[PDB]
Design a binder for this molecule. Structure first.
Ligand SMILES: O=c1[nH]c(=O)c2[nH+]cn([C@@H]3O[C@H](COP(=O)(O)O)[C@@H](O)[C@H]3O)c2[nH]1
Ligand SMILES: O=c1[nH]c(=O)c2[nH+]cn([C@@H]3O[C@H](COP(=O)(O)O)[C@@H](O)[C@H]3O)c2[nH]1
Ligand SMILES: O=c1[nH]c(=O)c2[nH+]cn([C@@H]3O[C@H](COP(=O)(O)O)[C@@H](O)[C@H]3O)c2[nH]1
Ligand SMILES: O=c1[nH]c(=O)c2[nH+]cn([C@@H]3O[C@H](COP(=O)(O)O)[C@@H](O)[C@H]3O)c2[nH]1
Lengths: 388, 388, 388, 388
């Protein structure tokens, strides 16, 4: 049920939800120098200068990437159910994924990801990241946590991400469902929970003890769950609803639970739109898969692509456009806002007069589908700038 | 008339109708394991585990396909006014339809479908399906029913579908119009009636004795009636209006008349959206014409294409992507949700917390045109996943 | 001003107008056999079985086409300011226009159309059409009428069309403006006036003595006025507003002034949508330029293309798909509703239960942008049916 | 905050903003001869017959273009932070920009635009334009004005444009922010200020002493700021809001500050739409870069493309379609409304009955996305007229 009830037909209503591509940000009463724009966020006791997290996807984050992201002031999450924990040396496996043709990568991944997880590799990945001075953030599905959460705790990871395509505090197992309250209470580190798109679920995740909530179902560049299942709420609406839960939970308890907008982001402008709708940080995959150091070798695939029965992701060719440093902090060599993402955030905040991220969440927004079309006929035809 | 009156101009109003591509499904309060999702539906006394019916189209269903579908838990309808009853061996005819060029198939079909129906073949198709252990479901137009309904009864078909592009209980013949009340009373088997898109007509079809109602005018992949006639209501709105008639008819009489969303479905997500708007089952053609066993040999054409005066269908090349087994129950080798349709339904129901089809009809819906665009720039450009 | 005031910005409002491609027709309470559908309309004392008028465009109507259309039960208008009155032999000129390349036709037409009008040819075209048994309908611009209206009267044309891109009863000349009241009173034949898109103007044209009003600014397939000037109201809204003026004028005076929806029509479905919004007949150009007998030799150009200072039309390649008989009354060999237009109207009226054109004007309409997209992915990709 | 609050999600609202491509103009009560349409505007004491200003962009305006535009009754602005002030002979530089490939121009421009500004060239450009009989209009960014405003005054420029992507009267420097009140008071010539898109900012710019306000953030054909930053309000809404500020400032003080719609204009129709929403004149770049005399050699690039850290523009290929005379006053050789822009304005005003620009600002507007799609299937497919 909802307080908004557009009529689909007799006895069936809906509410309008707006996508990243439908909104735009409006200047306020003042501008400010981009150098003054404060972009920090915080999860648990970990402060970060860059409000960006690399998705737990095998084309995006390996141990080296996690360290490079940590040194730049950002974060990267290693997926503990991917190739990194199933193979001692993932590089030959990543080589095969990148070289196979378009009609074959699904069947290949279904085979390669069938190799059983080695619990010892969970520990090693955590420890080799930390030994190199990086923040060790790792992800598990709810089922994975029931099996490997204690391994993560004993290894001493800095952050645990429990991430399912759609998560709730209430799950009807066929089997004991994962008790998220117990998990957050028992794990020695902060626990991030996702994904959701509704006020109701995000609030319950916060009440369960979440250190942050991941918002987004299916917006990702390599994700097909929306086509396979028909499930999803566009990001601006999802982010705003979950930010409202954050603010109500803060009022109730005094505890601040950051909201992370997860997926569907290509440009710095996409990031800024997500912050304006309430996000404290963003989780992105495809923009970082384009880094020279990315394990995907120019490819980027969803972690549900290898499902043996029902793939819900695909493998796309994103290419390689620069170093992870250039992508995050520049200098930008490109015209499309996919490099120097931090500089884009600070520049946008400057034009809008937002001194820090909380002020950025307060900027006025317009519904403006023409933002991406007005005057862009040449760019679209010639695949330049906003038309690439 | 309608209770909603958007203004087109002075003295002309309209109501907004929403298409499959305009909506999305929102998670509820709980998730559940897909293995617990009950996907059954029932028409007459026939229960089916898969809520899918193959359209009565010559590229989709022949006798073998009808048996294969029944064995898997679904249904297939043989069109008794197509080539199956006009030719003892349809295979050479299907060969010609598939081999001729784009500028020639209309004229060819106008000729081939002029071969008179052989009443003995009506009996033969029904009985050869049943002798092989399949459920024999057959379709006729209203005019066809006035001539051949008794032949279908004498042959002992399990289900009769009366299907016109647009049907009503009230028809002004130039001829005696088909009395649908008498037909349903006199036929010894359940009679499905369609097609319609309004509460008013669907309710009258139920009062006439329909075992089910087919909803949809022109959404089909090989249909051109919307361009030829300008008639149609997008599916979510039509389904909801007709589901409302079902619920009112149930309150009035205690009899449940399932609503079948007919046409325009490509992916598992499209199916789930139709159920969420009130459908008890779906009738699909093009997704099954892509089966290796489909008689269309990779082509799919509307059964109004052969009209000698005004074709209202076309012949499209849908290709061959897998076996009918793979398409309906998997395992899925593809990234786009066109295989393992049953698995997609159960997985979607799982993410939404819908234990059975009735609960699925209650899931919250958003108007979200961005569901199909957010983040999908690569998929569209490379024709992968949702961009194919 | 208007009673609908959507906000563009502070102090600037607007009203929503809907295009042909945004609406669809909804079945009513009954269906009827297409053979019973009465499609007649009437202008002056001239009854026509086919409610279609061929546009006064040099690629569409010459003397032969005007006769062929009259014989089939329709009408064709000869433009008295085009090639037909500037050259004794238009065929070599039409050959050149159709034979020159895309980058050259503007300059060529600017040259060719500078040849002065020969008033004697006005008489000749009218008289040769009538001598062949055809209805002689001719068009002039308002300025043209001030110079040649008496020639048309002396020649004895059956119908006079006064047509400007945008006409009003009130025009500020630099020159004596055309007195439309006097024109209609003095002309011995019915005078059709256009074009307009508003209730206010159409009502004044009616009060001035119009036998019919032409509705439409810029929807045409070979028209660019909307891009050059930014002026226009989409057809459904324009038709409905002008139909309301017709109904009010009828109440005031008892005189019925038919509303003609002019331009932007490709298929029979487009015609039916225009009738449903209030049109008594349609004026179409591009569908008839596709006739084997069309003077355009497969090309179709706007009559403002030859402007020596500011072209407001272009030349498109529409091809040649059949005889004018096939296009209007079939039998249709095509799958896209561009042939057997009369059969399409009658079939559509049948599905909607409309016994005559007045009933067709009462059919329910939905705002349904998805009408043209639902399920049409294959047709669009393969350029078949609705995707051509 | 705003008086319109569409809901994005709980606790986040927005207002609908409409783009140029979403609106259309409606005829009024009368038409008038285009020769009677008064298109004049005025800034300071400078009256101009053509309400068009060439953008301060290096592909659009050099000294020759500025003179040619002035002679025709328009204006051209020289960007004093581009190559015209960094190189004594810009031609070899313009040659290089036009010769490099798509993947190379960003890096090249970052290098070429790093050449320091030569203050003596500021004087030279201004005075050589005036010596040739042209009106010398020049642009600076706010930071540039703090350094070179006195140089412009000493040189005796006719108009000074202070232009930033987003400007406000309130700017938080890291440094003394530019005092716009002092600037306008101390400069001996009129000072135009921009850019903005809100009533609040434009009103303050007027109160600071602006001779005109530039409206627009990111609509330009060679701009990517909307993608890089996510900031922008579509032009019709921005123009109307800022025109409302003009009218209130006029009521307050009796001083008229013209509103200039800046960017995103391709055709005469786009111009007319902007005037109808309140603009007193338009600033355009890409349509004038297509002139034979344009310094871009057929290319057109944003002046933020050369940013060494975060480019916010791109280089597009606009080609060369005619002389600047043909583009502005015709005769038009093209079918798409990109030539004879003045004739298009007067013709549009004629169809609408607008005797002067103030009446044009009062024309009725419809929200009509179908203006650019209705009937245009051929034009789009064949890239003719409105489909190029
Ligand atoms: O439906 C899905 N199937 C998948 O296979 C999949 N893999 C990743 N994700 C989610 O997408 C996010 C990455 O989005 P981008 O690539 O656009 O950053 C990630 O951060 C996840 O939230 C998936 N969603
Ligand atoms: O207007 C029409 N003209 C035709 O020739 C035609 N043939 C099939 N159908 C209908 O389309 C449904 C199949 O749609 P899909 O191929 O999208 O499943 C089918 O189940 C039918 O409802 C037609 N509709
Ligand atoms: O703006 C315009 N510039 C032109 O050059 C032009 N030529 C024809 N017309 C109008 O278009 C109608 C024909 O439209 P179709 O080809 O789509 O039928 C015709 O019936 C006219 O109303 C023009 N409109
Ligand atoms: O965001 C931006 N980055 C740039 O690099 C840039 N360069 C020009 N402009 C603005 O665009 C206007 C020209 O627009 P058109 O080429 O569409 O006329 C100009 O008049 C400016 O207002 C820019 N905006």
């Amino acid at each position: 049920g909802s307080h908004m009830n557009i009529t689909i037909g007799r006895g069936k209503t809906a509410r309008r939800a707006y996508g990243i591509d439908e909104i735009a940000l409006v200047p306020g009463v003042r501008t400010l120098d981009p150098a003054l724009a404060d972009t920090r966020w915080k999860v648990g006791a970990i402060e970060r200068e860059i409000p960006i997290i690399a998705s737990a996807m095998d084309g995006v984050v390996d141990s080296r990437m996690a360290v490079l992201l940590s040194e730049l002031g950002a974060l990267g999450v290693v997926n503990l159910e991917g190739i990194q924990t199933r193979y001692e040396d993932p590089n030959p496996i990543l080589d095969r994924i990148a070289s196979v043709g378009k009609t074959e990568f699904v069947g290949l991944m279904q085979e390669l990801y069938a190799e059983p997880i080695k619990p010892e590799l969970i520990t090693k990945r955590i420890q080799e990241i930390q030994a190199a001075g990086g923040i060790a953030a790792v992800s598990l599905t709810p089922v994975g946590a029931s099996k490997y959460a204690s391994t993560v705790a004993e290894a001493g990871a800095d952050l645990l991400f429990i991430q399912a395509t759609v998560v709730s505090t209430a799950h009807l197992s066929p089997v004991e469902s994962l008790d998220l309250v117990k998990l957050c209470q028992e794990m020695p580190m902060p626990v991030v929970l996702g994904n959701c798109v509704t006020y109701e679920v995000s609030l319950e995740l916060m009440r369960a003890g979440a250190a942050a909530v991941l918002v987004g179902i299916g917006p990702g560049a390599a994700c097909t769950s929306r086509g396979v299942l028909g499930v999803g709420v566009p990001q601006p609406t999802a982010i705003a609803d979950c930010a409202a839960a954050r603010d109500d939970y803060l009022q109730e308890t005094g505890r601040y639970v950051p909201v992370i907008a997860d997926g569907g982001i290509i440009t710095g402008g996409d990031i800024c739109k997500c912050i304006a709708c309430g996000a404290d940080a963003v989780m992105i995959g495809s923009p970082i898969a384009r880094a020279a150091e990315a394990p995907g070798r120019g490819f980027h695939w969803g972690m549900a692509t290898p499902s043996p029965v029902l793939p819900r992701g695909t493998r796309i060719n994103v290419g390689t456009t620069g170093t992870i440093r250039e992508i995050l902090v520049g200098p930008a060599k490109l015209d499309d806002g996919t490099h120097n993402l931090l500089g884009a955030i600070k520049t946008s905040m400057g034009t809008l007069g937002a001194k820090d991220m909380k002020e950025m969440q307060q900027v006025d927004v317009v519904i403006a589908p023409s933002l991406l079309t007005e005057g862009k006929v040449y760019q679209k035809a010639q695949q330049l700038g906003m038309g690439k």
